[PDB]
Structure 1
Amino acid sequence: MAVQISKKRKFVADGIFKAELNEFLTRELAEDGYSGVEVRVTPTRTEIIILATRTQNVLGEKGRRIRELTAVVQKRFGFPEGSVELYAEKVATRGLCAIAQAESLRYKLLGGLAVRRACYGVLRFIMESGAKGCEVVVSGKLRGQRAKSMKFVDGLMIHSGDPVNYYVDTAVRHVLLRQGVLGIKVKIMLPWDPSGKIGPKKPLPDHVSIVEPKDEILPTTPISEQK
């Protein structure tokens, strides 16, 4: 770069890069249980951290797939030789991640399991994992040539105002069967977690809580006490 690009173009181009990388990884690592990518920079080096539920499938027999993925990421995005490193990392609390639950429901349906038996199978596992509530939806040609939908729901679920940006986790997916495409949508509502990264640290806007009064003595008589 013989003269540097302006800050408006620089900040937009850095966002366009993260979007294409997330699409490539989404469709390479679908059955391997992918759920997100994180990227960080240091002098002469870029480190990419990738989250999945079955990390040994991301590596392969002696690390083959990490070496193949390092090669194609460098080849496509134009990094110089050896400046790119890929690290696989294991997903914590996989029942509270909406993308891993949308993909496992997609592969469970694609194997020929019945729709209600599959949907109550994930609805139980999300609520046993410690969510405050959830909503699962399937739609398309469910049983016959005319389209239908099903809602499955449990616990609490908010729809309006700013808290939706940090208390609700969501995913949408497609599955192709011999008669055409079905849609899947998954929503999960997270628990409040003061510190520990199960959920958000910020409380709900209308949850006031009062501290309890303690240990007073009702009677008194006048006395003095020297040190």
Structure 2
Amino acid sequence: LISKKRKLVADGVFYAELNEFFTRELAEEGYSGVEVRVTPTKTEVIIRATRTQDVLGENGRRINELTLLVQKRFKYAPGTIVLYAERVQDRGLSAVAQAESMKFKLLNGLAIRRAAYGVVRYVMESGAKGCEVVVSGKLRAARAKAMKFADGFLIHS
């Protein structure tokens, strides 16, 4: 018994919280997004990632624990929530996936220019019209600055 305004805002904030949870825990699985589909008797959560075998685990054990996690937190009845994993296409055309891969390369210890040119070459090879990666912060010095790496053409307005 809820108004339509509050119901639509509530499932918007549910989508936002679910996306934040998935991007916090599935960062090393190439998590590229989430989609929600409400259905009579069942709501389904489609995770769009790259490493679906790591998202699933053995006999989908990580899928079962993720369903149980979202169930326990969002107070769903047993059987009412179901999660599926799906291998996203065009991985080069996914800014979240490219940003996470660059983050993990920089954490492992790759040079900034090498990592950025790798990601821009991969995105340009994947058929994009343009790519642009910016790295900001303390780069080799205490004074912070920003480095830009672009290829192709990008529009802004």
Across the aligned residues of Structure 1 and Structure 2, the Cα RMSD in angstroms comes to: 0.8
Alignment of 1:78-157 (within 5 A): 78-157=75-154
Give 5+ residue unaligned stretches, structure 1. 161-227
Aligned residues: 157
Q: Distance in 2 between matches of 1:42 and 1:111?
A: 42
Larger helix proportion of the pair: 2
SS class of match (2:155): coil
Give distance in 1, aligned partners of 2:115 and 2:2: 51
The one-letter amino acid of 2:77's match is: P
Cα deviation code 1:95-124 (max 9, x no counterpart):
011100000000001001111111111111
User: 1:190 maps to what in 2?
Assistant: none
TM-score (norm 1): 0.68
Does residue 7 (structure 1) correspond to residue 4 (structure 2)? The answer is yes
1: CA distance between counterparts of 2:80 and 2:57? 22
Aligned AA for 1:134?
C
Q: Which has the higher contact order (CA 8 A, sep 6+)?
A: 2
AA in 2 matched with 1:65: R
Distance 2:78 2:24 in 1: 25
Alignment correspondent of 1:210: none
4+ runs deviating over 4 angstroms = none
Q: 1:39 aligns with which of 19, 33, 36?
A: 36
Structure-2 separation of matches of 1:101 and 1:112? 17
Q: Which residue of 1 aligns with 2:53?
A: 56
Greater Rg, structure 1 or structure 2? Answer: 1
- Deviation at residue 70 of structure 1 after TM alignment: 0.7
Gaps of 5+ in 2: none
Task: Give the 5 Å matches for 1:132-211.
Answer: 132-160=129-157
